[PDB]
Design a protein around this ligand. Structure first.
Ligand SMILES: CCCCCCCCCCCCCCCCCC(=O)OC[C@H](COP(=O)(O)OCCN)OC(=O)CCCCCCCCCCCCCCCCC
Ligand SMILES: CCCCCCCCCCCCCCCCCCCC
Ligand SMILES: CCCCCCCCCCCCCCCCCCCC
Lengths: 100, 102, 478, 162, 55
């Protein structure tokens, strides 16, 4: 009896909140956290869409989504550790060596 | 059904009573009684291996509950999956990624 | 739907490249050998390229509820495999100067080629998403392969963050599309609407979000700002692969999605894509006017050429040769970018440490490297649409496609962008011949690859009929 | 059923809002874990039992554990972060919040104009998900294993110490 | 009055316009990742608004 539109609205709210955290935060760690929030919100939207139609496609796409999310979190944290090792800071605005 | 709503109430009561019991004993411990190094990247490597192999484990979790329905074709697909996973594990072992002491 | 032996022999390049990945990993685990691992990688890619002929014998069919194999898949799989083989050939002399481990490069190139083949064979939203990420993550590895160098690490961080954001956008768009439709098949995206309500708001918003993700992946305005920095910071073979294989595979799957989805006929999506292509052509041509770096200039070149590709894409539902035009343009653009970035890589090889600059210094290249300068100026003229080049044949195809569908704004954009591209391409080609003040067969192999690419561009610009016949023979399923 | 969905959705929204506006990394990750638990509760209220199970097993049990591992490895004491308060100045966050709000209203207007008979909430078991995973989605499983392998190889190559 | 070829300058005016437009457009390539994400979100807003208007 739960509407599909309300679940999609919740997913959209979480997605724009994660994107706002990705934009306004100068830390690379909080940028990765906001990215995690966005991909989790997309997976939530897929689960709601799959459960509305009564199919396993939403859960399968969620499984692929969280596989990608885990791999991307690993990749971003490895890059963050490399940045903190070789520059001793996580300022994403200071790493702007090439431009124009 | 009466049984399913009774079971849901029992599970809710279990969760609530357990959390409230630990909270109550924390409150009682707080209430009673008078008063008076740089970490290496091997931890990251171990945790990342845990994450990747846990996602491959979740794929195997999904497969294992439907082995009979998938038939021999699903067995073949999971065999290639497990062979790729074991090749990755052997690759990690042989390059010293899983060795703590150098 | 299950998998038959016919479905297995139609799965030959995917299985061959995956088996190559497993064999290369077991060889690395046995003993770290750069030459043996690179040889295994190129033998596996060539085996996939020659097993494409057996796939063509097997015919065209649907292999999965996800994949579909036809001449479309043949052509784009061949382009991706050729790009990956050229990337390995350019990568070996660059990796000869690498102090750290070198064998992971070919593993990542093989996995990215696997993602490109999946994108070529993709007939599903799940397969499209998985191919996009299977291309992206090895590119995350390859762009920041020289993570000690500041430029490569910065490009890796930028590419990883922006591609994660675009993947989230694309997945949310697929989620909205699936909520609207109820089936993830390419043909079923809009089959539940009729009698003139194809412009459903949820379907349009979802398709717009995947348009945002793919326009990031195709360097389309205004998701194009990453292109010069990621192209410059990454290693030159990585720049070659990112310019050719990723763009070709993503544009091929976008072609297949917009051909098969009934909602691709909707006018709002076509107008939005027309605006995107117009702005992409104009911006990518104007922003390369005053670039002293060859990598950023080639990145803006990639932006403008993908704008031309999108211009050919818009008339897909009206014209009949639009996908044929896209195939011819993509073959010519593959050869052009292969030659240009191969000359860049051969000048940038071997890797002379992370603390030293990788500056090109293309001025006066003819006076010590005459053959490479000749190849570089041939590819520079090819990228400009100048005749007797394959890039001119692609530009002519794009112009004819735009003329057929009365998309005159896009045609004027192509003309103006061609003039600006003429300016900067001719500036580079004439700076090659001004005045300014190897020793192994892998470098000779890379020089042979760029020379063969230049000769192919010249021959198929003078005589373009065999390529046109080959592209027309790659007929997908209606 | 709908009560749990609405309460867990509100909890997840509040927790994510506290995540994006926090300075302590460990507190931000704790609020993120709380939001993940709430989203898994939303999953369980919708009948996607496997989705919630993998949300707390993997998303709140592997990925967030990796994030907390990295945070406590760096010993982030808020150097030039806790003493800046840059994201709380309105000249920094008014713009992006207005942009995200505009996109939210656009997406909400798109969402409100779709056919919706509601979600019956019938529990889709993990058995059917595993049947579809190793049936019509074999290549998805194999190439997802390939993708996880690629991510593992890249993260090993980047995150070495030497 | 005509020794400076005024029609040549009149037809060379679009070259100056193209150079100025390229210089103005190159300011968006400042190398800041947060600006890149903000521009991606701006493009998402623009694309979605255009699709909602033209629907
Ligand atoms: C009360 C005011 C607030 C007080 C403070 C916050 C307390 C926690 C609030 C959130 C968690 C509890 C929400 C209420 C659940 C009550 C049970 C319920 O609604 O069950 C319905 C349904 C049972 O299953 P079903 O078969 O669908 O039943 C349909 C009936 N024929 O259930 C389902 O289908 C699934 C039920 C939800 C999933 C399991 C529980 C998840 C809990 C997540 C907690 C996240 C962290 C919260 C932290 C709060 C403090 C910061
Ligand atoms: C029109 C398509 C391309 C045709 C070939 C263009 C030229 C390719 C390079 C050939 C070699 C050029 C050598 C130039 C030598 C100039 C010496 C000047 C001395 C003052
Ligand atoms: C900068 C590029 C400018 C291109 C202008 C093209 C104008 C085309 C006008 C077509 C009008 C069609 C009317 C029906």
């Amino acid at each position: 009896m739960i509407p599909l539109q309300h679940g999609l609205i919740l997913a959209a709210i979480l997605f724009v909140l994660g994107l706002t955290g990705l934009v306004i935060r100068r830390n690379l760690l909080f940028m990765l956290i906001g990215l995690e929030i966005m991909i989790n919100a997309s997976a939530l939207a897929f689960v709601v869409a799959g459960s509305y139609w009564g199919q396993t496609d939403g859960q399968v796409m969620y499984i692929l989504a969280i596989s990608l999310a885990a791999a991307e979190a690993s990749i971003g944290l490895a890059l963050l550790l490399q940045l903190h090792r070789r520059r001793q800071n996580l300022n994403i605005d200071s790493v702007s060596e090439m431009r124009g | 059904s009466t049984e399913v709503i009774a079971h849901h109430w029992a599970f809710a009561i279990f969760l609530i009573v357990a959390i409230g019991l630990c909270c109550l004993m924390l409150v009682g411990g707080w209430f009673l009684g008078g008063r008076a190094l740089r970490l290496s990247a091997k931890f990251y490597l171990v945790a990342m291996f845990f994450v990747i192999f846990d996602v491959e484990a979740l794929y195997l979790f999904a497969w294992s509950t439907s082995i009979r329905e998938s038939g021999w074709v699903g067995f073949v697909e999971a065999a290639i999956f497990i062979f790729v996973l074991l090749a990755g594990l052997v690759y990690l072992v042989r390059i010293g990624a899983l060795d703590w002491t150098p | 739907m299950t998998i038959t032996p016919q479905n297995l022999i139609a799965l030959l390049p995917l299985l061959i490249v995956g088996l190559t990945v497993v064999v290369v990993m077991l060889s690395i685990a046995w003993r770290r050998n750069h030459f043996l691992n690179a040889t295994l990688s190129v033998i596996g890619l060539n085996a996939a390229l020659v097993s494409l002929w057996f796939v063509g014998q097997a015919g065209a069919m649907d292999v999965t509820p996800l994949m579909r194999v036809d001449g479309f898949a043949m052509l784009y799989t061949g382009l991706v495999l050729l790009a990956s083989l050229a990337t390995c050939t350019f990568a070996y002399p660059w990796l000869e100067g690498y102090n750290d481990n070198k064998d992971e490069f070919y593993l990542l190139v093989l996995i990215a080629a696997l993602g490109g083949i999946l994108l070529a064979n993709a007939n599903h939203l799940a397969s499209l998403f998985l191919g996009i990420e299977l291309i992206s993550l090895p590119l995350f590895g390859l762009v920041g392969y020289a993570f000690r160098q500041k430029r490569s690490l910065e490009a890796s961080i930028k590419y990883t963050i922006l591609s994660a954001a675009a993947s989230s956008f694309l997945l949310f768009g697929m989620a909205l599309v699936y909520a609207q439709s109820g089936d993830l098949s390419f043909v079923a995206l809009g089959k539940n609407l009729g009698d003139g309500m194809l412009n459903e708001p949820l379907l349009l918003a979802g398709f717009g979000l995947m348009i945002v993700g793919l326009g990031f992946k195709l360097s389309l305005v205004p998701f194009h700002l990453w292109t010069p920095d990621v192209y410059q910071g990454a290693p030159a073979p990585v720049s070659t692969f990112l310019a050719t294989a990723s763009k070709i595979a993503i544009f091929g799957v976008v072609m297949r999605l917009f051909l098969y989805a009934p909602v691709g006929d909707s006018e709002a999506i076509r107008v939005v894509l027309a605006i995107i292509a117009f702005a992409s052509i104009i911006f990518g041509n104007l922003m390369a006017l005053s670039q002293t770096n060859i990598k950023r200039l080639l990145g803006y070149s990639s932006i403008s050429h993908l704008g031309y590709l999108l211009v050919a894409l818009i008339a897909l539902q009206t014209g009949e040769m639009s996908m044929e035009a896209v195939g011819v343009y993509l073959a010519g653009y593959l050869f052009s970018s292969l030659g240009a970035f191969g000359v860049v890589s051969l000048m940038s090889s071997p890797y002379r440490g992370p603390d030293a600059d990788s500056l090109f210094s293309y001025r006066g290249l003819f006076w010590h490297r005459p053959i490479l300068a000749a190849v570089m100026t041939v590819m520079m003229l090819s990228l400009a649409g100048i005749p007797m080049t394959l890039g001119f044949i692609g530009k002519f195809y794009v112009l004819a496609v735009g003329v057929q569908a009365h998309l005159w704004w896009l045609v004027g954009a192509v003309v103006v962008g061609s003039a600006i591209g003429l300016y900067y391409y001719l500036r580079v080609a004439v700076s090659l011949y001004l005045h300014a003040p190897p020793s192994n067969w892998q470098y000779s192999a890379g020089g042979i690859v760029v020379l063969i690419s230049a000769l192919l561009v010249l021959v198929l610009g003078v005589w373009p009929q065999p390529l046109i016949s080959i592209v027309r023979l790659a007929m997908p399923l209606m | 059923m709908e009560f749990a969905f609405y309460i867990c959705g509100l909890i997840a929204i509040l927790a994510t809002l506290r995540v994006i506006t926090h300075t302590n990394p460990v507190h931000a990750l704790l609020y993120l874990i709380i939001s993940l638990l709430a989203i898994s509760g939303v999953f369980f209220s919708l009948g996607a039992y496997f989705a919630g199970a993998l949300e707390i097993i993997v998303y709140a049990g592997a990925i967030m554990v990796l994030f907390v591992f990295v945070v406590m490895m760096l010993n982030l004491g808020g150097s030039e972060i806790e003493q800046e308060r840059q994201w709380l100045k309105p000249q920094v966050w008014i713009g992006p919040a207005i942009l995200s709000a505009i996109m939210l209203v656009v997406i909400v207007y798109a969402i409100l104009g779709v056919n919706d008979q509601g979600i019956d909430g019938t529990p889709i078991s993990a058995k059917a998900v595993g049947i579809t995973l190793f049936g019509p989605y074999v290549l998805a499983v194999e190439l997802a294993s390939m993708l996880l392998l690629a991510g593992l190889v890249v993260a090993f190559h980047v995150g070495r110490e030497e | 009055l005509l020794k400076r070829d005024p029609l040549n300058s009149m037809m060379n005016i679009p070259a100056v316009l193209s150079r100025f437009a390229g210089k103005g457009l190159l300011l968006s390539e400042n190398g800041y990742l947060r600006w890149y994400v903000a521009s991606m979100s701006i493009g998402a807003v623009v694309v979605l608004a255009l699709l909602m208007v033209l629907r």
